[PDB]
Amino acid sequence: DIQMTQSPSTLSASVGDRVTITCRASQTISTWLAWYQQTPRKAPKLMIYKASILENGVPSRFSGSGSGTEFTLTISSLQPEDFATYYCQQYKSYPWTFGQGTKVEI
Amino acid sequence: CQLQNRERALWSGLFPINPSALASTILDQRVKARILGDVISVSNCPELGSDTRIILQNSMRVSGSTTRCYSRPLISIVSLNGSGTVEGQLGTDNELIMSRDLLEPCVANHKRYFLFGHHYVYYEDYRYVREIAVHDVGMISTYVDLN
Amino acid sequence: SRDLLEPCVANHKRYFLFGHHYVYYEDYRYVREIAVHDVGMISTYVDLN
Amino acid sequence: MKTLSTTFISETNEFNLNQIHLSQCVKEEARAIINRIYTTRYNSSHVRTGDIQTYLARGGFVVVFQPLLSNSNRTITTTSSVEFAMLQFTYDHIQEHVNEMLARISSSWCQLQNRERALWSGLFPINPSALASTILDQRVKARILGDVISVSNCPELG
Amino acid sequence: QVQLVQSGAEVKKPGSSVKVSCKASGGTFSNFAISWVRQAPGQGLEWMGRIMPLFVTSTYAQKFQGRVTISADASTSTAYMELSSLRSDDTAMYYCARDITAPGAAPTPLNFYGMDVWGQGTTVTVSS
Amino acid sequence: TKPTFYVCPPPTGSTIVRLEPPRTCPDYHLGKN
Amino acid sequence: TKPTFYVCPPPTGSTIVRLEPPRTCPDYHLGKN
């Protein structure tokens, strides 16, 4: 809940790998987690809300799962536009404290 | 054959009470039905597409009035293409009415659970209180087994 | 007897069974009729062959 | 073989009649017999699907089988009874028919239950306590709290 | 589509305000719940309060509740995020996020479909 | 998964239907002399 | 015998239930090549 942990900092990979960006929670977020993506010279952008639902304009190679305190962002068929920072977002009770790191995949 | 011919009487006697549910079950497809005397007029219900944000309102009370209140939660269908904002209310079985014509005399000690997608949103005294996932509510089964 | 009355609704459309026909009344007046065998059917019957 | 009421059970492998002494007859004799049968019965309805195949059935028989398709060293010892093969045919027939009928009963039962669920769901508003007492096999008092049902047990008057 | 823009490259000394604006483009601004996030160079991200339609309350975060004030117009389609503290820790890239909502909505996480559209980034520096 | 909502426009007399009448049941003549 | 009467106290929201959704029906793959 109010404080969330993340995955290791880098998780290096190549084009075509299945990478999981697992981040965890504190007080059983009941499927109320959002995932983002911020390249080094952009603004973050919505990837997953409700821990499983994709946003309009996001390729269906992205996935998400987990229900309580354990949420994963498993990518498959990693096209060469996945080399960005990712963030877990908690919306169950204010404040909406952001989560993950996962700087870059190179 | 005898059992089917008898259950036809229950089906015929229950259509006036809920025509849309029975017609959706019989037709294996979501429809909206009316009883036009001795016949049934059906109409297909197209599913709400994407680029559509359904917002759930906090209070079920009519503005200003205190002796009158709504029966089902009100929703605001916010648009993304800039087509404005539709305002209806939450029907049954995730049906989104495009109007707010379901009113009721404002009862005392009000407690209701409404189906909003995969959750049962709870309204106590005409105000949002909490929500619970559908998979968490206990079930009773009308199904008889034949293994 | 004629003891089935109702508040006179607006935009009235009803079909009534008169023998082998569905006589149609629109705004509380006779309009047309259609045979029963012409109206589409839905079946509550489950098959067991 | 529905005309004989006999079912033979081979392996998936072919049988090489060269492992058997003095088996030069079978190939050509069966070719002639099968050609006559085809030309007299299936000349226009079906078409052949390769050369004749030889299988060693169970109990010591040799089936020379010609596959059709519609227009759309040792010795072999044979038992003195084909009662086991008639038993096999009869069991296969009864088993297949009864299994088809059981499958149909099951599918219809599932469809009927899924349909009666609509009557149950549409009649709960009218009388929740009676339907909830029937479903729960126990006397209860139920209310419709919107889209859910809140039950409560009714203790018997002592 | 919708576009949100901040002030731009800002340099402010410690002991003043910043007053970052956030101009919108469409969406009628009656369906905008403007949130504000930030992260210093080398930090992940943070959250700095949400101002919901009929913009009068502007619930703030835990750490900036005594510092920041956020407001909107509903007629200009803008959102302001003055701090007025600048404790020398206010050196980040302030963003102007936005979630879709409606006035009178319920305080439920079923009405949160994520911060779909965002701003540009301010890159504010507090030092002399 | 993602919840699906519906929108039911008001019906029109165009498509009218009825319940099918009860089907007759076959008499099985199982029995020999 | 002796008639048994009941006493039904007013329910409470504690125990709420719902009708189970319709069960899927098994596809019987009876049939051979």
Residue numbers in the entry:
A (entry chain L): 1 to 106
B (entry chain A): 540 to 686
C (entry chain B): 638 to 686
D (entry chain C): 393 to 464, 503 to 588
E (entry chain H): 1 to 128
F (entry chain A), G (entry chain C): 115 to 147
Sentences reproduced from the published study:
Varicella-zoster virus (VZV) is a highly infectious, human host restricted alphaherpesvirus that causes varicella (chickenpox), establishes latency in sensory ganglion neurons and can reactivate to manifest as zoster (shingles). The most conserved herpesvirus protein, glycoprotein B (gB), is classified as a type III fusogen due to its structural similarities with vesicular stomatitis virus (VSV) G protein and baculovirus gp64. In contrast to these fusogens, gB requires additional virally encoded glycoproteins, gH and gL, which are implicated in membrane binding and priming of the gB trimer, to induce membrane fusion.
A 2.8-Å resolution cryo-EM structure of native, full-length VZV gB in complex with mAb 93k Fab fragments was determined, revealing residues within gB DIV that were then shown to be essential for membrane fusion by evaluating DIV mutants in a virus-free assay. To define the molecular interactions formed between native gB and mAb 93k, a 2.8-Å structure of the gB-93k Fab complex was generated by using single particle cryo-EM, coupled with stringent particle selection and validation of local resolution (ResMap34), and feature resolvability through Q-score assignment (MapQ35) to amino acid side chains. However, class averages were not identified in the cryo-EM micrographs that resembled a prefusion form of gB in complex with mAb 93k Fab fragments, underscoring the highly metastable status of the prefusion form of herpesvirus gB. The 2.8-Å cryo-EM map provided near atomic level details of the mAb 93k footprint on VZV gB identifying interactions between the variable heavy chain complementarity determining region 3 (VHCDR3) loop and regions in DIV, encompassing residues 589–597 of β23, 613–628 of β25-β26, and 658–670 of β28-30 (Supplementary Spreadsheet 1). On one side of VHCDR3, sidechains of I100, A102, A105, and Y113 formed a hydrophobic network with gB residues R592 and I594 of β23, and V617 and L619 of β25. The sidechain of gB R592 formed a cation-π interaction with the aromatic ring of VHCDR3 Y113 and fit into a negatively charged pocket within the 93k antigen binding site. The H-bond between gB E670 OE1 and VHCDR3 T108 OG1 was surrounded by hydrophobic interactions formed by gB β28-30 residues F655, H658, V660, and Y667, residues P107, P109, and L110 of VHCDR3, and W32 of the variable light chain CDR1 (VLCDR1). Thus, the 2.8-Å cryo-EM map revealed a complex network of hydrophobic and hydrophilic interactions at the gB-93k interface of postfusion gB with the strongest interactions between gB β23 and β30, and the 93k VHCDR3.
